């Protein structure tokens, strides 16, 4: 697994972000993550979290896993890093996402993100409160 560069076009919600990738606008869905919808409990906190993290980054990198790169809606499937920090993980860590949509072949960071989740779940952060 390697990082590829991209530039923010637009924050969307807690687990989607519109990015410029290899010259094309592409909506990315975050691997292994499920944030609440913007109108559920902690949805706006999730959107705000991802938004701030992508908006402040000097460098946004896209990292595909070893499986499918595009979902059935045409969304890129990737781990996204904001100045070297993984948005996917930080959401788990902050208690603003649950680990979800784990398909074998696209799961390199499962343990890591479940670790973050475990610690968020320990502290009773946000959705675990
Ligand atoms: C995260 C992820 C989502 N998806 C698809 C499955 C969709 O299920 P449905 O067929 O039930 O819509 C899901 C919805 O994600 P959202 O959480 O963005 O709504 O997006 C994948 O196919 N692979 C993935 O890795
Ligand atoms: Ca969601």
The resolution, in Å, is 2.0
Element (H, E) at 61: strand 60-64
Structure-solving method: X-ray
- Cα separation values, 35 from 45, 49, 99, 107, Å: 10, 11, 9, 17
| Rounded Cα gap, residues 99 and 114, in angstroms | 7
List the domains of the chain with CATH numbers: 1-129 (2.40.50.90)
| 19's tokens | 């990015």
Q: Is 75 a catalytic residue?
A: yes
* Closest-lying ligand 1 atom to the alpha carbon of residue 16: 18
Return phi, psi of residue 100, to 5°: -155, 170
* Pocket around ligand 1 at a 6 A CB cut-off: 29, 31, 34, 71-72, 77, 101, 106
Which residue in 86, 77, 19, 78 sits closest to 49, CA to CA?
86
Q: Measure the N-to-C terminal CA separation of the chain; round to a whole number of Å.
A: 34
Q: Is 37 a catalytic residue?
A: yes
Q: Is 27 annotated as a binding residue?
A: no
Q: How far is the centre of ligand 2, averaged over its atoms, from the C-alpha of 36 (Å)?
A: 5
Q: Which of helix, strand or coil describes residue 60?
A: strand
């Amino acid at each position: 697994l390697h990082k590829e560069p991209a530039t923010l076009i637009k924050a969307i919600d807690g687990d989607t972000v519109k990015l410029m990738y290899k010259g094309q606008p592409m909506t990315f869905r975050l691997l292994l993550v499920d944030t609440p919808e913007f109108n559920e409990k902690y949805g706006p906190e999730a959107s705000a979290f991802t938004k701030k993290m992508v908006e402040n980054a000097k460098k946004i990198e896209v990292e595909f896993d070893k499986g499918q790169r595009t979902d059935k809606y045409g969304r890129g499937l990737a781990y996204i890093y904001a100045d070297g920090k993984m948005v996917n993980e930080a959401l788990k860590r902050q208690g603003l996402a649950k680990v979800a949509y784990v398909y074998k072949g696209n799961n390199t960071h499962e343990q890591l993100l479940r670790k973050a989740e475990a610690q968020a779940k320990k502290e009773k952060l946000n959705i675990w409160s």
